[PDB]
Amino acid sequence: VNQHFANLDDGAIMAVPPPPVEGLGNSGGFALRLQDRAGLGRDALLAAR
């Protein structure tokens, strides 16, 4: 599915497998929260992002 639709012209499309354990996330892998711990601001937040 990812190979067939890798060249979609209007938007983005992505196929993923379900997470191994229900209730611990939307998918497998890692989930990090980047935190504005110094109040750099939304523009600086998007720059660092």
């Binding site: 060249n7 979609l8 012209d9 209007d10 938007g11 983005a12």
Partner: peptide, 27 residues
């Protein structure tokens, strides 16, 4: 109103997946 002229080839697709100066295949 400004910034375009007749005959210009504008891209109407894949805009989010294209960076300035990148090479593309026109359909």
């Amino acid at each position: 109103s400004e910034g375009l002229q007749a005959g210009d080839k504008v891209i109407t697709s894949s805009l989010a997946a294209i960076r300035p100066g990148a090479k593309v295949i026109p359909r």
